[PDB]
Amino acid sequence: LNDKIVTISCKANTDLFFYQVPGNGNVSLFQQTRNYLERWRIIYDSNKAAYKIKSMNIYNTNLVLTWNAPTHNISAQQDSNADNQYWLLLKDIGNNSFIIASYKNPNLVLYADTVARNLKLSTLNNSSYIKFIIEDYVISDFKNFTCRISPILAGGKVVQQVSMTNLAVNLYIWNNDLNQKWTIIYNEEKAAYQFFNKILSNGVLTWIFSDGNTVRVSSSAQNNDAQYWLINPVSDRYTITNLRDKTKVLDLYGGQTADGTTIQVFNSNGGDNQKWNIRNP
Ligand SMILES: OC[C@H]1O[C@@H](O[C@H]2[C@H](O)[C@@H](O)[C@@H](O)O[C@@H]2CO)[C@H](O)[C@@H](O)[C@H]1O
Numbered sequence: 374l375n376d377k378i379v380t381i382s383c384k385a386n387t388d389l390f391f392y393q394v395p396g397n398g399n400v401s402l403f404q405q406t407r408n409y410l411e412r413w414r415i416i417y418d419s420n421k422a423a424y425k426i427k428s429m430n431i432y433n434t435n436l437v438l439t440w441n442a443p444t445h446n447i448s449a450q451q452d453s454n455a456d457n458q459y460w461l462l463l464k465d466i467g468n469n470s471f472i473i474a475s476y477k478n479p480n481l482v483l484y485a486d487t488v489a490r491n492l493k494l495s496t497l498n499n500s501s502y503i504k505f506i507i508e509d510y511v512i513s514d515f516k517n518f519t520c521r522i523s524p525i526l527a528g529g530k531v532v533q534q535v536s537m538t539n540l541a542v543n544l545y546i547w548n549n550d551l552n553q554k555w556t557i558i559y560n561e562e563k564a565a566y567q568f569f570n571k572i573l574s575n576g577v578l579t580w581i582f583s584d585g586n587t588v589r590v591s592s593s594a595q596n597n598d599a600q601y602w603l604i605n606p607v608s609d610r611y612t613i614t615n616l617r618d619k620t621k622v623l624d625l626y627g628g629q630t631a632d633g634t635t636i637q638v639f640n641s642n643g644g645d646n647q648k649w650n651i652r653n654p
Pocket residue numbers: 624625626627628639642644646
């Protein structure tokens with residue numbers, strides 16, 4: 374869990390996520406944003422056997438979840454490695470969720486005050502309000518997400534199935550049509566994703582490996598790893614790697630941005646034409 378970037382959401386309301394409020398040190402419980410305001414790096418300390426929870430805020434990069442003793446308020450404060458900035462991550466095996474207990478006083482644990490939309494420090498109990506879902510942020514963002522996929526080279530255009538009956542995949546200006554939207558679904562067993570085109574019921578983005586680099590939408594088929602993909606952030610831009618051959622990534626032909634440009638797979642080569650934005654419509 375060390376060094377992992379996660380989202381943290383509430384068992385009591387799974388639509389509410391820990392959110393670092395811009396402009397101040399506040400932490401709120403907020404709807405899912407799929408951005409850095411709801412991402413936290415888990416940092417393990419060997420001496421304490423406890424963790425810091427550090428905001429991925431790009432403007433102030435060293436804020437950590439902090440109990441503002443002697444109050445019961447929780448905010449994001451500059452990291453000084455203080456005891457009130459360390460937490461025990463206790464996984465309830467009977468609920469598959471976490472209790473997050475203060476290292477400074479482990480009798481007190483995070484409590485989701487869903488009415489106040491913030492966190493307080495509390496005693497333990499059997500309520501869902503002290504239980505949290507900690508998930509890798511890419512899985513959190515993309516495990517069940519209807520999206521548009523755009524090349525970083527042309528933000529106003531999208532990867533699309535050509536039409537309901539033409540299963541080729543190309544680039545075209547965004548028009549909010551069904552064939553231009555995809556539902557990403559994470560498969561836990563395979564630890565990979567499928568992209569279901571919204572104009573079909575069972576059509577997924579597929580590498581047609583029998584035809585070179587071709588990508589088409591095809592019916593989801595039991596045993597075809599070419600229909601699964603890995604989504605990796607670029608060291609919110611992503612490469613999209615095929616599971617059948619992880620040297621092959623989704624590729625905008627020649628970095629061309631004209632309407633009709635081919636979407637395919639290609640050898641991974643670090644080009645801007647292999648980097649993608651994945652966004653809400
Ligand atoms: O399958 C097409 C590949 O094109 C490569 O870019 C070429 C481009 O097609 C060519 O016209 C010229 O500009 O040289 C480029 C290489 O630097 C992409 O690099 C590749 O990823 C594929 O898209």
